[PDB]
C-alpha cells in the first residue's frame, strides 16, 4: 500500500533515503495487534482513530486527554493519516495529568496495569506499549519497564530531550526495553535527542505532524514523537509475523538503516527504524 503526501516520518520509515513523501506498507497495517499508549490519555473520538482507540485506565479525575501529548503519540502509532500501524487497536492509560506531569509511583502502576490488562484484550498478533515519558534515574521505574517487557509486551520508551546520555534517565536507561532517540527529516540527530549506549534505535522526532485534541492536528518535536514510530513499527511487524514482543527491538535494530544519521556521538548506535517493505 502507498499513502501519498504522508508526514515525512512515515515516509522515512519505509525508505532507504530521506527526502521522499510517500509511505509504503503492507496492507495488514497492524491488524490484530494492540498498542498501549501510556501518557496523558487519548482523544478516542478523534475521526482519525476510526473507533480503534479507547481509554482503558486513568489515575486522575478524567480519562480524557486535556493536554494533547498522548493523542499526538497515539496518532503516530495508529491514526489513519498520521499513523504507522493504521489498523492496530489503541489503548490509552492516563498516567500523566493534563499538564503532562506524573509521579513515578503512578507511572509504575500504569506499567504493571498494562502487563495484566493485556490478558483482558484480544491481541492475537501481539502487544506493544509506547512510553513517551521519563525523568531522572530510578531503579524502580526501570524495573517496572522490565516487568512489562518480560510479561510479553514490546516496550518502546523515549530516550529523553536533554541532549545528554540517556543512562541517567528512566525508563530510558532500562537495558531490556527499546530506547528510542530522535532524528530529523535530513537524517540528523535531533538537536534535543538524548544519546548513549542505552539507545537501541532512532526514529523520526523533529517536526512530526499528528493528531491533537479538539479533533485537530499539529506538528511538534521530541523523543516522545520518535517513540510511537517505533511502537507502531513493532505492531506492524508483529502482525506480519516477522518478530515477537520479546524480539522486536532487536529485529528493528537488525533491519534498520545503518550509518545514515549525522551527529551521532561515538558509542551511540547509528540505526534508523525501517520497515523493509518491498511493494
Curated annotation (Swiss-Prot):
Listed as disulfide-bonded, the cysteine pairs are: 34-123, 178-249
- Which family is annotated? Belongs to the peptidase S8 family.
Could you name the domain of life of the organism this protein comes from? Eukaryota
As to how many cofactors bind and how, the note says:
Binds 2 calcium ions per subunit.
Q: Where does the record place the catalytic residues?
A: 39, 69, 224
Name all Peptidase S8 domain ranges: 7-279
Q: Which GO terms describe its molecular function?
A: metal ion binding; serine-type endopeptidase activity
Question: NADP: present as a keyword of the record?
Answer: no
| Residues holding Ca(2+) 2 | 16, 260
Quick one: which residues bind Ca(2+) 1? Answer: 175, 177, 200
> Which reaction is this enzyme known to catalyze?
Hydrolysis of keratin, and of other proteins with subtilisin-like specificity. Hydrolyzes peptide amides
- What is this protein's name? Proteinase K
Q: Which cofactor does it need?
A: Ca(2+)
Q: What does this protein do?
A: Hydrolyzes keratin at aromatic and hydrophobic residues.
Span-the-membrane segments of this chain are: none
The GO annotation for biological process reads:
proteolysis
What are the annotated GO cellular component locations? extracellular region
Enzyme class at the top of the EC tree: hydrolase
Enzyme Commission designation? 3.4.21.64
Q: Which UniProt keywords apply?
A: Calcium, Disulfide bond, Hydrolase, Metal-binding, Protease, Serine protease, Signal, Zymogen
Q: Which organism is it from?
A: Parengyodontium album (Tritirachium album)
Amino acid at each position: 500500500a502507498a499513502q501519498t503526501n504522508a508526514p515525512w516520518g512515515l515516509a522515512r520509515i519505509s525508505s532507504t533515503s530521506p527526502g521522499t513523501s510517500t509511505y509504503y506498507y503492507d496492507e495488514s497495517a497492524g491488524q490484530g495487534s494492540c498498542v498501549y499508549v501510556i501518557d496523558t490519555g487519548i482523544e478516542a473520538s478523534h475521526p482519525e482513530f476510526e473507533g480503534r482507540a479507547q481509554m482503558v485506565k486513568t489515575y486522575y479525575y478524567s480519562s480524557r486527554d486535556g493536554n494533547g501529548h498522548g493523542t499526538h503519540c497515539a496518532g503516530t502509532v495508529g491514526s489513519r493519516t498520521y499513523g504507522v500501524a493504521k489498523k492496530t487497536q489503541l489503548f490509552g492509560v492516563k498516567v500523566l495529568d493534563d499538564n503532562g506531569s506524573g509521579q513515578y509511583s503512578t507511572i509504575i502502576a500504569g506499567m504493571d496495569f498494562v502487563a495484566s490488562d493485556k490478558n483482558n484484550r484480544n491481541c492475537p498478533k501481539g502487544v506493544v506499549a509506547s512510553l513517551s515519558l521519563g525523568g531522572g534515574y530510578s531503579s524502580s521505574v526501570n524495573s517496572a519497564a522490565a516487568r512489562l517487557q518480560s510479561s510479553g509486551v514490546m516496550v518502546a520508551v523515549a530516550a529523553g530531550n536533554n541532549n545528554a546520555d540517556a543512562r541517567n534517565y528512566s525508563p530510558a536507561s532500562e537495558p531490556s526495553v527499546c530506547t528510542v532517540g530522535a532524528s530529523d527529516r535530513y537524517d540528523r540527530r535531533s538537536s534535543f535527542s538524548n544519546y548513549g549506549s542505552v539507545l537501541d534505535i532512532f526514529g523520526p522526532g523533529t517536526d512530526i505532524l499528528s493528531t491533537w485534541i479538539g479533533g485537530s492536528t499539529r506538528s511538534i518535536s521530541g523523543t516522545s514523537m520518535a517513540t510511537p514510530h517505533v511502537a507502531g513499527l513493532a505492531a506492524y511487524l508483529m502482525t506480519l509475523g516477522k518478530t515477537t514482543a520479546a524480539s522486536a527491538c532487536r529485529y528493528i535494530a537488525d533491519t534498520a538503516n545503518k550509518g545514515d544519521l549525522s551527529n551521532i556521538p561515538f558509542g551511540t548506535v547509528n540505526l534508523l527504524a525501517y520497515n523493509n517493505y518491498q511493494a
